[PDB]
Amino acid sequence: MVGGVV
Ligand SMILES: OC(C(F)(F)F)C(F)(F)F
Ligand SMILES: OC(C(F)(F)F)C(F)(F)F
């Protein structure tokens, strides 16, 4: 899994 960035 690759987490999102805000
Ligand atoms: O999981 C959240 C998302 F979806 F990427 F915005 C977080 F902001 F925490 F990264
Ligand atoms: O409101 C956004 C959230 F939801 F926190 F990701 C922002 F990144 F802009 F802060």
Side-chain angles (χ1 to χ4, degrees):
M1 183 179 181
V2 179
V5 293
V6 304

